[PDB]
Amino acid sequence: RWKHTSSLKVANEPVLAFTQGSPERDALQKALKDLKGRMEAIPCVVGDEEVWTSDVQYQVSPFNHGHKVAKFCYADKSLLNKAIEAALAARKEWDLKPIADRAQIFLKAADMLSGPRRAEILAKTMVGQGKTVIQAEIDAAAELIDFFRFNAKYAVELEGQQPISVPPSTNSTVYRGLEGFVAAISPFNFTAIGGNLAGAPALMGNVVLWKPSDTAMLASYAVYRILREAGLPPNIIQFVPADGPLFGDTVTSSEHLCGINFTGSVPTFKHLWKQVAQNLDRFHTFPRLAGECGGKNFHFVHRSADVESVVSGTLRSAFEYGGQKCSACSRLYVPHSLWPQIKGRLLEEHSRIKVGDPAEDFGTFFSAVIDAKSFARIKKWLEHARSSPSLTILAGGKCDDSVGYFVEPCIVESKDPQEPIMKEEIFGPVLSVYVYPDDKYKETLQLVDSTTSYGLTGAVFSQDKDVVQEATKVLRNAAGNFYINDKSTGSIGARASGTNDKPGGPHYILRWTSPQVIKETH
Amino acid sequence: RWKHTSSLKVANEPVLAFTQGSPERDALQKALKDLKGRMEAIPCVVGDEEVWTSDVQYQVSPFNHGHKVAKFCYADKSLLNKAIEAALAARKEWDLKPIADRAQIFLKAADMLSGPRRAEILAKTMVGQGKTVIQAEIDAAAELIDFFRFNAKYAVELEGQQPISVSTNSTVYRGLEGFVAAISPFNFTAIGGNLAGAPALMGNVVLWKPSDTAMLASYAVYRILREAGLPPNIIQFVPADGPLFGDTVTSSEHLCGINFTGSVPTFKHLWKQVAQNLDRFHTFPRLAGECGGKNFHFVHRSADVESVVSGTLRSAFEYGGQKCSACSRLYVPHSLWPQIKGRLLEEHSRIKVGDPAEDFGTFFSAVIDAKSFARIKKWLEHARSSPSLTILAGGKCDDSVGYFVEPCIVESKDPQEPIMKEEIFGPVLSVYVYPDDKYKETLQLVDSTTSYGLTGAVFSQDKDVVQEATKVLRNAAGNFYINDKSTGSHYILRWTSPQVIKETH
Ligand SMILES: [Mg+2]
Q: Give me the DSSP letters along A318-348.
A: HHGGGG-STT-EEEEEEETTTHHHHHHHHHH
Q: Are strands B286-291 and B255-262 parallel, antiparallel or unpaired?
A: parallel
In B, minimum Cα distance to A522 occurs at B483
Q: Is B265 annotated as a binding residue?
A: yes
Determine contact, residues A318/A429, Cβ cutoff 8 Å. yes
N residues, chain B: 505
Return the closest-CA partner of residue B496 out of B281, B225, B177, B267. Answer: B177
Instruction: Give the Cα separation of B113 and A92 in Å (integer).
Output: 45
Q: How many CB atoms lie within 10 A of CB A206?
A: 28
Give me the residues paired with residue B171 across strands.
Answer: B500
What are the C-alpha distances in Å from A516 to residues A4, A177, A296, B9? 21, 10, 40, 25
| Segment (H or E) for A418 | none
Yes or no: domain A296-491 corresponds to CATH 3.40.50.2300: no
Q: How far is CA A373 from the centre of its chain?
A: 19
Instruction: Give the Cα separation of B408 and A103 in Å (integer).
Output: 50
Of the CA atoms within 13 Å of residue A522, those in its CB half-sphere come to 8
Determine contact, residues A215/A129, Cβ cutoff 8 Å. yes
Across the beta sheet with A237-239, the strand order is A49-51, A44-46, A237-239, A208-211, A181-185, A257-263, A288-292
What are phi and psi for residue A405, nearest 5 degrees? -85, 65
CA of A499 to the centre of ligand 1 (A): 9
Instruction: Give the Cα separation of A31 and A125 in Å (integer).
Output: 11
- Compute the radius of gyration of chain A from its Cα atoms: 24
CA of B414 to the centre of ligand 1 (A): 50
Task: Give the gap in angstroms from C-alpha B5 to the nearest C-alpha of chain A.
Answer: 19
Q: Is the dihedral of CA B189, B191, B194, B199 positive or negative?
A: positive
In B, minimum Cα distance to A480 occurs at B499
Q: Which residues of B touch A519 (CB under 8 A)?
A: 479-482, 484, 488
Q: Which residues of B touch A482 (CB under 8 A)?
A: 499-502
Q: State whether A504 and B488 contact (CB < 8 Å).
A: no
Report chain B's terminal Cα–Cα distance, integer Å: 15
SS3 B388: coil
A295 upstream amide cis, omega within 30 of 0 = yes
Return the closest-CA partner of residue A257 out of A237, A287, A291. Answer: A287
Task: Give the gap in angstroms from C-alpha B401 to the nearest C-alpha of chain A.
Answer: 39
Return the closest-CA partner of residue B300 out of B255, B326, B337, B346. Answer: B337
For B483, which of A481, A485, A521 is closest by C-beta distance? A521
Instruction: Give the Cα separation of B487 and B78 in Å (integer).
Output: 41
Return the closest-CA partner of residue A451 out of A499, A418, A496. Answer: A418
Considering B44, B73, B324, B397, which one is annotated as catalytic? B324
Task: Give the gap in angstroms from C-alpha A367 to the nearest C-alpha of chain B.
Answer: 28
Report chain A's terminal Cα–Cα distance, integer Å: 15
Determine contact, residues A411/A393, Cβ cutoff 8 Å. yes
Q: Are strands B496-503 and A288-292 parallel, antiparallel or unpaired?
A: unpaired
Q: State whether B96 and A473 contact (CB < 8 Å).
A: yes
Instruction: Give the Cα separation of B415 and B420 in Å (integer).
Output: 6
What are the C-alpha distances in Å from B212 to residues B41, B129, B185, B193? 13, 10, 8, 14
Instruction: Give the Cα separation of A462 and A443 in Å (integer).
Output: 16
Q: Is B61 annotated as a binding residue?
A: no
Q: Angle at CA B424, nearest 5°, toward B334 and B262?
A: 135
Instruction: Give the Cα separation of A468 and B303 in Å (integer).
Output: 67
What are phi and psi for residue B232, nearest 5 degrees? -65, 150
B242 upstream amide cis, omega within 30 of 0 = no
Determine contact, residues A152/A107, Cβ cutoff 8 Å. yes
CB within 8 Å of B290: residues ≥ 6 apart: B260, B261, B324
Element counts in chain B: helices (H) and strands (E): 16, 21
CA of A147 to the centre of ligand 1 (A): 9
Burial class from Cβ neighbours inside 10 Å (0-12, 13-18, 19+) for residue B243 reads: exposed
Instruction: Give the Cα separation of A221 and A59 in Å (integer).
Output: 12
CB within 8 Å of A449: residues ≥ 6 apart: A474, A475, A477, A478
Q: Are strands B205-209 and B64-73 parallel, antiparallel or unpaired?
A: unpaired
Q: Which residues of B touch A488 (CB under 8 A)?
A: none
Q: State whether B481 and A505 contact (CB < 8 Å).
A: no
Q: How many CB atoms lie within 10 A of CB A388?
A: 16
CA of A151 to the centre of ligand 1 (A): 12
Instruction: Give the Cα separation of A298 and A496 in Å (integer).
Output: 19
Q: State whether B502 and A490 contact (CB < 8 Å).
A: yes
Return the closest-CA partner of residue B53 out of B70, B83, B78. Answer: B78
Any idea of the CA torsion for A300, A303, A309, A311, to the nearest 10 degrees?
70
Return the closest-CA partner of residue A128 out of A193, A195, A184, A225. Answer: A193
Determine contact, residues B152/B106, Cβ cutoff 8 Å. yes
Q: State whether A499 and B496 contact (CB < 8 Å).
A: no
CB within 8 Å of B305: residues ≥ 6 apart: B336, B339, B340, B343
For A518, which of B158, B284, B482 is closest by C-beta distance? B482
Q: How many CB atoms lie within 10 A of CB B253?
A: 12
Q: State whether B496 and A514 contact (CB < 8 Å).
A: no
CATH classification number, B294-489, choose in 2.40.10.120, 3.30.930.10, 3.40.309.10, 3.60.10.10: 3.40.309.10
Give me the residues paired with residue A171 across strands.
Answer: A519
What are phi and psi for residue A394, nearest 5 degrees? -100, -25
Q: State whether A277 and B279 contact (CB < 8 Å).
A: no
B324 catalytic? Reply is yes
Determine contact, residues A249/A171, Cβ cutoff 8 Å. no
SS3 B299: strand
For B475, which of A176, A505, A517 is closest by C-beta distance? A176
CA of A340 to the centre of ligand 1 (A): 37
Determine contact, residues A369/A404, Cβ cutoff 8 Å. no
Strands (E), B43-192: 44-46, 49-51, 56-61, 64-73, 168-175, 179-183
Instruction: Give the Cα separation of A271 and A245 in Å (integer).
Output: 10
Return the closest-CA partner of residue B485 out of A169, A37, A99, A18. Answer: A169
CATH classification number, B20-293+490-505, choose in 3.90.1150.10, 3.40.50.300, 3.40.605.10, 3.30.230.10: 3.40.605.10
| Segment (H or E) for B410 | strand B408-412
Return the closest-CA partner of residue A379 out of A394, A358, A401. Answer: A401
- Compute the radius of gyration of chain B from its Cα atoms: 24
Task: Give the gap in angstroms from C-alpha B59 to the nearest C-alpha of chain A.
Answer: 33
Alpha helices in B140-263 (DSSP H): 147-158, 193-201, 215-227, 242-250
Instruction: Give the Cα separation of B297 and B315 in Å (integer).
Output: 9
Instruction: Give the Cα separation of A69 and A431 in Å (integer).
Output: 30
Q: State whether B504 and A482 contact (CB < 8 Å).
A: no
Q: Where are the domains of chain B?
A: 20-293+490-505, 294-489
SS3 A399: strand
Return the closest-CA partner of residue A232 out of A104, A111, A90, A105. Answer: A105
CB within 8 Å of B102: residues ≥ 6 apart: B94, B155, B200, B201, B203
Q: Are strands A430-436 and A410-414 parallel, antiparallel or unpaired?
A: parallel
CA of A142 to the centre of ligand 1 (A): 10
In A, minimum Cα distance to B505 occurs at A485
Determine contact, residues A233/A90, Cβ cutoff 8 Å. yes
Q: State whether B499 and A521 contact (CB < 8 Å).
A: no
SS3 A448: helix
CB within 8 Å of A211: residues ≥ 6 apart: A183, A184, A185, A186, A240, A241, A242, A244, A247
For A280, which of B272, B279, B502 is closest by C-beta distance? B272
- DSSP symbol at A429: S
SS3 B22: coil
Give me the residues paired with residue B289 across strands.
Answer: B260
Q: State whether A270 and B276 contact (CB < 8 Å).
A: no
What are phi and psi for residue B10, nearest 5 degrees? -135, 130
Exp. method? X-ray
| Segment (H or E) for A53 | none
In A, minimum Cα distance to B287 occurs at A288
What are the C-alpha distances in Å from B13 to residues B54, B189, B199, B456, B466? 41, 22, 22, 26, 32
CA of A498 to the centre of ligand 1 (A): 7
Q: Is B289 annotated as a binding residue?
A: no
Q: How far is CA B418 from the centre of its chain?
A: 25
Q: Which fold has domain A20-295+492-522?
A: Aldehyde Dehydrogenase; Chain A, domain 1 (3.40.605)
What are phi and psi for residue B158, nearest 5 degrees? -50, -40
In A, minimum Cα distance to B480 occurs at A518
Q: Is B184 annotated as a binding residue?
A: yes
In A, minimum Cα distance to B154 occurs at A503
Task: Give the gap in angstroms from C-alpha B11 to the nearest C-alpha of chain A.
Answer: 13
Determine contact, residues B270/B246, Cβ cutoff 8 Å. yes
CA of A352 to the centre of ligand 1 (A): 30
Q: Is B489 annotated as a binding residue?
A: yes
Give me the residues paired with residue A433 across strands.
Answer: A332, A413
Task: Give the gap in angstroms from C-alpha B388 to the nearest C-alpha of chain A.
Answer: 27
Instruction: Give the Cα separation of B433 and B442 in Å (integer).
Output: 10
Any idea of the CA torsion for B27, B32, B37, B40, to the nearest 10 degrees?
80
For A521, which of B268, B484, B505 is closest by C-beta distance? B484
Instruction: Give the Cα separation of A455 and A298 in Å (integer).
Output: 9
Q: Are strands A297-301 and A457-461 parallel, antiparallel or unpaired?
A: parallel
Q: How many CB atoms lie within 10 A of CB B41?
A: 12
Instruction: Give the Cα separation of A213 and B176 in Å (integer).
Output: 32
CA of B490 to the centre of ligand 1 (A): 21
Q: Which residues of B touch A270 (CB under 8 A)?
A: 278-279
Element counts in chain A: helices (H) and strands (E): 16, 21
Q: Is A15 annotated as a binding residue?
A: no
SS3 A127: helix
Instruction: Give the Cα separation of A339 and A347 in Å (integer).
Output: 12
- DSSP symbol at B208: E
Instruction: Give the Cα separation of B465 and B486 in Å (integer).
Output: 18
What are phi and psi for residue B331, nearest 5 degrees? -115, 125
Instruction: Give the Cα separation of B317 and A232 in Å (integer).
Output: 48
CB within 8 Å of B494: residues ≥ 6 apart: A504, B257, B259, B286, B288
Q: State whether A505 and B488 contact (CB < 8 Å).
A: no
What are phi and psi for residue B13, nearest 5 degrees? -70, 125
Q: Is A211 annotated as a binding residue?
A: yes
Instruction: Give the Cα separation of A454 and A291 in Å (integer).
Output: 12
SS3 B432: strand
Active site residues of A: 292, 326
Q: State whether A483 and B503 contact (CB < 8 Å).
A: yes
Instruction: Give the Cα separation of B357 and B41 in Å (integer).
Output: 21
SS3 A126: helix
